[PDB]
Symmetry: D3
Subunit: 146 residues, 6 copies
């Protein structure tokens, strides 16, 4: 894939500061779909507002985990089947905790939003399409699990 280098080059920016960038992704996600806020429950409490999630060490650690799994997809962008079973197992964990398959698009839109805002003019049409394809391949792998 020639778009493998578009993904690698565009991820370098974000990968140097994964929590700041992941913070944009989750801020966007809760602005688009605040009904996902209750899925993140730590110490038996529900976040009242999206800004409450940003004060939780557990939640910020969850952001870091998400960013490491996207980073792994980037590392394996030229295949992606090297991570197939890890992603199917990650999908099984999602279904277990009550996440719906239909919510995948909103997370993808939040990731694309975060990339658009970080790269500016460098988030070219080809770069956008390459990320949509990567994300789609990741979600397909995770979808085996429902």
């Amino acid at each position: 894939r020639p778009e493998s280098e578009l993904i690698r080059q565009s991820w370098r920016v974000v990968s140097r500061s994964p929590l700041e960038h992941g913070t944009v992704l989750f801020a966007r996600l809760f602005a688009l779909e605040p009904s996902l806020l209750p899925l993140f429950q730590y110490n038996g409490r529900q976040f009242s507002s999206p800004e409450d999630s940003l004060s939780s060490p557990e939640f910020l650690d969850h952001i870091r985990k998400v960013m490491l799994v996207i980073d792994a997809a980037v590392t394996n962008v030229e295949d992606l089947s090297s991570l197939e079973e890890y992603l199917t197992s990650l999908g099984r964990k999602h279904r277990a905790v009550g996440v719906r398959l239909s919510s995948f698009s909103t997370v993808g839109e939040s990731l694309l939003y975060m990339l658009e805002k970080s790269l500016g003019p460098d988030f070219t049409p080809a770069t956008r399409t390459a990320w949509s394809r990567l994300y789609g391949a990741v979600v397909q792998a995770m979808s085996r699990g429902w």
Copy 2:
């Protein structure tokens, strides 16, 4: 069930003032999912904002009805099969008016939110888990209807 007493003890607080507590539950529900606001249409009009629903006698009467059905679940917590057909009939009514099965989780999260906020430190881990199980049993009964 030993958690039957956790449910009964925790419901006494809320059951003494069902409209105030139900008001928290619906306020939370519309904050998490404002797309449910149009399902409550009285006198051929749509609520523009969540606060509009709180001014409607019909809507507040709907809150009271919801709270009485949760109260009935509490009264029958040691079985729950005593209410099985009433709940299946309630499920049929829901499908009829356009409510989706997928919205059950958001209502459950709103109920758990209302209980967390009312009980504070008394909403222990065991109490939380007991309510999730009760609510799950109620939704399972209602789900026969779609």
Copy 3:
């Protein structure tokens, strides 16, 4: 004042259920001006969302207090100078806790909103103007205090 009976007649509806109606007024107030939410701090904690305030016994008791002071204005609508010093003392308490004079209009708009929604077609033009005048007279009395 002939509008004294418009105020008395229109207040009877609301006065029979002061917490439900006051709940609409404060729900509207926080929807219009969420920056007022932090002024209501009980047990050293800030409400994260407007729906959090509706779960607080202290806050609901504050609503009841507000509704009793509007009720007192209605009781004294034919004069209003009978309550002048009580209202000036209430104004002093407001300035003390950090409330700004400029926020009076938003509270007035929330009260008028609550009355419009409760009375429907009975909230005639004359009724609206009578309430605006009463509220203005109340705020003038309270404004001595800043």
Copy 4:
């Protein structure tokens, strides 16, 4: 259908200024379901806020297209099978771009909202029911496509 004239008479108001009215419909749609905002992507960019969509010529042109297709349904209200294949083809296009069948209700609620707000007292019970039936027939035609 006798409600054919209720639909025609009520549409004349809106049809004279299709962009202003369509603007209400989409403003309502994004207020109820902001997660639909990312589906409208032009020039490789995502709208950050609903008000951003109203500044986009492409988006306003999309509103005009939607309003012309509702207008065509009105023109063919006495049958509706004259437009069956056009609507099935429109449904296929929707599935292609990632729109879910479940989102149809929210668009219907936004259309009914726009009609209620435009007609006021002229949006009688019979008029409301006639539009719900028309919209339902349109969505049924479009649903063949998923």
Copy 5:
């Protein structure tokens, strides 16, 4: 002023469709400051949500009036003292209806937002600064009135 041509050239875009552009400005204004929504009251009713304002013929006519007064400022950009008394009289009307001097900045930010979104890359730094200066001169003229 050499920035007189930057203002004239940038206004031509917007002036051809004043209601669509004014709609962006007011949508932005209510998103930034929803407490201004109650100031626009027609037929003795308050808008519950910003989208309600967009359904009101009176409100859309108010948008057109605002856009004509900005257009007049553009027409007189090389002086602006030709409109001094009209603007002072407009300021007096504002104070009368309860608008605060402090709200001028938010309206200016909404206008600049609308211009940024309409012009894109054509809303250069010099164009931005020229509009800020024009708007400031308009508000100074209107401020005599409080």
Copy 6:
């Protein structure tokens, strides 16, 4: 001051990760007062949504600056007059860019919110009061400038 150690001890938590904590403070600030979003304009563009600010390197650098100035107040908590002229000069800069004195309370509430959420049960009554006093002393110093 004995509350000097309450401030120092409570700041250690936050001072180790100033951007994450500052991010909570600004997220809260924009949730309470979205009309402050346009004051942060970089590269001649306005943030459409609060989440847009979190993607801006300039804005995140502004957060770091704010956190360093609060850190300086903590370092000088036993006097605070050691920073008097720096703070008066910072106040002059604020007035210059259009910030209002009245917005100080909302920033203080956002800071207290961030501290409450970071410390949990360690944000005792005495700790809360100590921070309110420090913040008040800072704002008093900055207020010379308007």
